[PDB]
Design a binder for this molecule. Structure first.
Ligand SMILES: [K+]
Ligand SMILES: [K+]
Ligand SMILES: [Mg+2]
Ligand SMILES: [Mg+2]
Ligand SMILES: [Mg+2]
Ligand SMILES: [Mg+2]
Ligand SMILES: [Mg+2]
Ligand SMILES: [Mg+2]
Ligand SMILES: [Mg+2]
Ligand SMILES: [Mg+2]
Ligand SMILES: [Mg+2]
Ligand SMILES: [Mg+2]
Ligand SMILES: [Mg+2]
Ligand SMILES: [Mg+2]
Ligand SMILES: [Mg+2]
Ligand SMILES: [Mg+2]
Ligand SMILES: [Mg+2]
Ligand SMILES: [Mg+2]
Ligand SMILES: [Mg+2]
Ligand SMILES: [Mg+2]
Ligand SMILES: [Mg+2]
Ligand SMILES: [Mg+2]
Ligand SMILES: [Zn+2]
Lengths: 161, 307, 89, 192, 91, 57
RNA sequence: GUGCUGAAAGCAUAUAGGCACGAAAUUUACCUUAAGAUAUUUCUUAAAUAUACGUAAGAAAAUAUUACGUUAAUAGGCUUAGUUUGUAAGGAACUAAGUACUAAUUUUAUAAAAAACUGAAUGAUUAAUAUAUCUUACA
RNA sequence: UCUAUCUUCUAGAGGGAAUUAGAAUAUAAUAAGGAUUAACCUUUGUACGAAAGGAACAUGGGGUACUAUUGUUAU
RNA sequence: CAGGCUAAUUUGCGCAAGAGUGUACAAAAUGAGUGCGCGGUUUGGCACCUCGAUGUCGGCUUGACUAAUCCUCAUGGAUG
């Protein structure tokens, strides 16, 4: 508009309905749960020490569950003796007995096969080169989107996303 | 809007979600409605690519002189069939002549490689009415594809005429010659009115410019002669273009299709002249994968020097 | 069943290496003529003009106009007296 | 609107254009070569190849049509039906060679060419091909296929043939004509 | 945007260049119809070339690349500012 | 003209698609190695050979 | 404009409701330009491809468009056959076909930077870890 | 009297942004325009009419080529 | 002069009513003097406005639009 005052009126947004029920007589404390994301300083009652005396009832009481997304189950199918076979095979033929071959043979998660055994250095350096030779076939447009995926993941863990 | 009454973004694909099987009215537009309102006109059979070779007369016994144009068929093959489930309409792609492999690009070399056909000079599509018009890929069409007396339409690019004036381009009369005219004999005169007509030149105004070198269709041209050895199909009347230019010949849309017996005899002659058109095509497709896989891996040199 | 073909090679001028090659198909070297067709149709409205089929996949005469003028003259003048009555003799 | 041009008009009148072509064909015979524009060298090339075709005819009409193209017949006809007739006796056409050259006039920067008579005393492709062969021998290099292809073109119909070509090479090496010639193996390392 | 491959960082190149106008070469007179005359100034001009070595282009490229890796990556849900201040809560 | 053409609309007409095109059809000369246009005769060897055939013959 | 059934309104009514006939106008059809989804068991890892140059043209104010470049009939020449002129001589702007005679012709010319995000389906390879302490082993 | 600066217009181009790495070839929905006249014979001279007069409807009039159709002679 | 306002007038029209004509019978056709209107073509009024004009217009070139229709297409009424 012409003046800043005229712009403020056209861009006005009224306050929340809750604030507009002003008491005619006296003061009243009202419950106005906001439609926003709560911060991390609102400790849930489960994380409060038993000593702490502020564990009140819900403020609702002073006046099914959502769909599962990730419910893992841990299994221990590899006995101590089977951990020695994994260390023998991996060190004997690391190209035939990969972590996928050993994972399927012993019914384990691929990460575990690496927790108990590690391939020889020569084989490890061979894997990094294959992925290094793969990172040279990327053009400038794909190499920039692959770096952004690695920065968005580190930022996510720094509280920046 | 940009084109017509539709405000839909061009990048949105909602066609599959508005189906007549769900109880919706059959739209008046779209590929389905476009084929339904052209079913009668659409030619039953494919056409052929021919080369205009010159004009002459067909002298007939007892006294008939019929001016006619000669069109030659030069190795007309069937290259591809366009189905409705894959392209949205029925058509046959026809090839003409040949081209040197060096001049044909790699994108097109691998296109003919997957069919068993030598590279062609030109390619053109001919719309057919239904799935009965699709022919085996790799079959040659001879002048006998037509019969004497069959009316056809010839589509060819007209002779180029460069920047034309108003007289030659739009048939303007011009102005006077000697009764006081001043430097304005072949000029177009007025280009509009005045402030009451928009104070502008009106879109679509006829003006000088380029003329010619565009497609023109001559309909209802009988077939006077059909000679296989020469490879020619003599049609009555004139045809657009210069000698040595490629033209498209197909059945007339404004005339009834040829009898059922003829449409079947011509299809029965392709199964005799080319008894194995599918075995030679499947073999070429099987080879394309081997070569396409050798190019990917990088071992194409081995196959070239195999024998 | 696999028709005859030749290989076309696209090489590099910088490294002298094969960039990509294709199998170019060629028409039968020795043109193969086929027996007369057995498709005989009887209909008044049309006749199949399959009198004399040429060899498959072969270029026809480039200039059929002078060859066509000798077909109509031989049909409009089976003897030659008319063609000779106006010759340059 | 009408027909296309049959030939180049060269922005001249009818009579002026027939004299321009008769003068280029007169200088071509008298001098065996001429350095003019490319459109002029390409229009006289058709009139010079048809005049040498008349010199290969035994009729008198050809001897009278050759007199009607040249501008000093009394002095140039003996050369036409003499040396030139013997030179091109066995060649089936193609008696002239038009070679594009850098502008003869730098003011207008009009593309120029060289119209010459093949197998002549001033054949510029016979000498340029001899200089290439001279450099190759004097630098221990191997001639390219295009040099070998040009070496045979300039020695197939020539009278002496290879002997006249080896003499030119010998005269260009004893003169040190190839001194300072950039070796073909150092062209990929040069920018300027 | 042109890609180069520099093997000799001392190679000279034309970094900058601009043309200026100098004094008036001369003056021609244009004699038109109706006894009219117009002055035609003959111009002379100069050019300036700023020659630099390829080390300037290798430095300017590393700066542009560092400025592109310093703007951060693209995030799906950015935290755009709300630029209106009001003395109440709207939620 | 009704108005004076601005610096923008005159700079469009002068330089938009009117940049001088770099000649890239340059090859070396077989006899001497000097840079010449493609399909064209060397100007320094033409004059030298043209003069070499005028002295001795 | 002309009807069928048929009530509101026991009748009547081509009025509501349910069907229909009906014009050089409209729409489609026909033709052209534009549009550029899509298609190909199509090509490309620094190219595919395009451009430049050269011979051209079914193209032509520039530009653009469509071919060709020696493994080549693109243009010119030559040759034969036509056509034309004319004495069945001698020529020839021209057309067709043939013919590599001339030119497409100098030693890695130029442009082209080239695979995003989320979900789902489905493979390959790999520490894809943390905490305590300052020594540890060897000679 | 006027060598067209701007908008509009008729043509043709340089660059471009595309579901998006870029291309070769053939291309649809759809869009914008073009084409657009009239007459004559042919009703069982019929319906109608005392007579004189005289329609509507419909088909055909593309072929000294094919084909269709109508005749003509030969079998 | 053109544009602008007005519509007396018009060689621009419509509707309502119906004296009358139609051998008969208002409305097949016809329609006195009138009333209610639309519209911006002719002759005018005004004067916001200086500009291409006193026959304000003709011919040529090239249009675009309107429909109150001369031709072509569909059709109701017509003791007449
Ligand atoms: K004049
Ligand atoms: K009605
Ligand atoms: Mg042309
Ligand atoms: Mg005239
Ligand atoms: Mg306006
Ligand atoms: Mg305007
Ligand atoms: Mg000039
Ligand atoms: Mg004269
Ligand atoms: Mg004076
Ligand atoms: Mg009822
Ligand atoms: Mg009723
Ligand atoms: Mg592919
Ligand atoms: Mg390339
Ligand atoms: Mg041009
Ligand atoms: Mg030729
Ligand atoms: Mg302008
Ligand atoms: Mg379409
Ligand atoms: Mg009509
Ligand atoms: Mg007949
Ligand atoms: Mg009365
Ligand atoms: Mg009327
Ligand atoms: Mg009636
Ligand atoms: Zn040189």
């Amino acid at each position: 508009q012409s003046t800043a005052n005229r712009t403020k009126r056209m861009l006005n947004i009224p306050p929340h309905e809750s604030f507009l029920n002003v008491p005619v007589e006296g003061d009243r404390i009202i419950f106005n749960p906001p439609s926003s994301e709560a911060s991390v300083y609102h400790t849930p009652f489960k994380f409060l020490p038993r000593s702490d005396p502020r564990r009140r009832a819900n403020i609702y009481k002073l006046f099914d569950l959502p769909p599962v997304l990730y419910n893992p189950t841990k299994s221990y199918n590899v006995t101590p003796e089977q951990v020695e076979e994994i260390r023998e095979l991996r060190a004997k033929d690391p190209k035939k007995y990969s972590v996928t071959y050993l994972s399927n043979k012993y019914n384990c998660t691929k990460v575990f096969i690496m927790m108990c055994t590690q391939a020889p250095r020569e084989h490890q350096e061979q894997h990094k080169l294959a992925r290094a030779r793969t990172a040279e076939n990327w053009g400038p447009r794909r190499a920039a989107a692959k770096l952004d995926a690695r920065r968005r993941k580190e930022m996510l863990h720094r509280g920046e996303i | 809007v940009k084109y017509g009454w539709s405000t839909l973004p061009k990048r949105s694909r909602p066609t599959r979600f508005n189906q007549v099987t769900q109880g919706l009215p059959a739209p008046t537009s779209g590929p389905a409605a476009a084929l339904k309102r052209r079913e009668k006109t659409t030619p039953l059979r494919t056409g052929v690519l021919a080369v205009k070779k010159g004009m002459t007369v067909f002298m007939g016994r007892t006294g008939a002189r019929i001016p006619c144009t000669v069109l030659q068929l030069d190795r007309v093959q069937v290259v591809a069939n366009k189905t409705r489930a894959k392209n949205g309409y029925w058509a046959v792609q026809v090839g003409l002549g040949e081209r040197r492999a060096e001049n044909v690009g790699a994108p097109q070399l691998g296109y003919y490689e997957a069919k068993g056909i030598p590279p062609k000079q030109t390619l053109a599509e001919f719309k057919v009415r239904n799935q009965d018009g699709l022919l085996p890929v790799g079959v040659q069409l001879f002048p006998d594809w037509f019969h004497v007396g069959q009316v056809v339409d010839v589509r060819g690019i007209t002779r180029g005429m460069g920047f034309a004036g108003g007289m030659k381009r739009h048939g303007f009369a011009g102005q006077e010659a000697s009764h006081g005219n001043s430097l304005n004999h072949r000029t177009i005169g007025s280009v509009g009115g005045s402030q009451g007509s928009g104070s502008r030149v009106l879109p679509g105004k006829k003006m000088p410019g380029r003329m010619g070198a565009q497609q023109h269709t001559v309909q209802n041209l009988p077939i006077l002669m059909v000679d296989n050895e020469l490879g020619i199909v003599v049609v009555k009347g004139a045809v657009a273009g210069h000698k040595g230019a490629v033209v498209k010949v197909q059945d007339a849309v404004k005339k009834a299709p040829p009898p059922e017996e003829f449409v079947e005899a011509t299809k029965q002659l392709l199964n005799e002249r080319f008894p194995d058109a599918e075995e030679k095509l499947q073999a070429a497709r099987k080879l394309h994968l081997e070569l396409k896989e050798a190019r990917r891996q990088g071992l194409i040199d081995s196959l070239i020097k195999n024998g | 069943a696999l028709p005859d073909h030749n290989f076309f090679r696209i090489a590099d001028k910088h490294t002298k290496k094969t960039r990509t090659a294709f199998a170019v198909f060629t028409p039968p070297k020795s043109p193969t003529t086929l027996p007369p067709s057995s498709v005989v149709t009887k209909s008044k409205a049309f006749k199949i003009a399959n009198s004399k089929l040429p060899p498959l996949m072969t270029k026809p005469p480039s200039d059929p106009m002078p060859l066509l003028t000798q077909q109509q003259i031989a049909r409009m003048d089976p003897t030659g007296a008319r063609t000779a009555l106006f010759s340059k003799a | 609107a009408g027909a296309h041009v049959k030939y180049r008009h060269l922005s001249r009148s009818s009579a002026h254009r027939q004299a321009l072509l008769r003068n280029l064909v007169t200088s071509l015979i008298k001098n065996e070569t001429i350095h003019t524009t490319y459109p002029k060298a390409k229009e006289a090339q058709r009139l010079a190849e048809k005049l040498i075709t008349l010199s290969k005819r035994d009729t008198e009409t050809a001897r009278r049509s050759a007199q009607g193209i040249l501008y000093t017949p009394d002095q140039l006809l003996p050369k036409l039906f003499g040396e030139i007739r013997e030179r091109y006796a066995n060649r089936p056409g193609g008696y002239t060679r038009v070679l594009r050259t850098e502008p003869k006039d730098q003011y207008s920067q009009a593309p120029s060419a060289i119209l010459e008579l093949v197998d002549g005393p001033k054949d510029m492709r016979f000498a340029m091909t001899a200089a290439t062969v001279a450099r190759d021998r004097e630098q221990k290099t191997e001639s390219t296929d295009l040099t070998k292809k040009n070496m045979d073109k300039v020695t197939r119909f020539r009278k002496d043939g290879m002997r006249a070509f080896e003499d030119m090479v010998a005269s260009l090496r004893d003169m040190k004509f190839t001194a300072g010639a950039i070796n073909p193996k150092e062209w990929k390392k040069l920018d300027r | 945007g042109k890609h180069l491959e520099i093997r000799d960082p001392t190679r000279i190149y034309v970094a900058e260049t601009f043309v200026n106008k100098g004094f008036t070469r001369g003056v021609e007179l244009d004699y038109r119809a109706r006894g009219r005359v117009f002055k035609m100034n003959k111009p002379t001009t100069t050019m300036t070339v700023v020659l630099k070595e390829e080390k300037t282009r290798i430095r300017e490229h590393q700066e542009r690349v560092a400025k592109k890796l310093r703007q951060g990556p693209w995030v799906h849900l950015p935290d755009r500012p709300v630029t209106s201040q009001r003395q109440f809560y709207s939620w | 003209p009704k108005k004076k053409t601005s610096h923008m609309k005159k700079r469009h007409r002068q330089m938009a698609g009117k940049a001088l095109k770099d000649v890239t059809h340059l090859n070396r000369c077989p006899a001497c190695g000097n840079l010449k246009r493609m399909h064209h005769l060397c100007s320094t060897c033409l004059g030298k050979l043209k003069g070499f055939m005028d002295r001795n013959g």
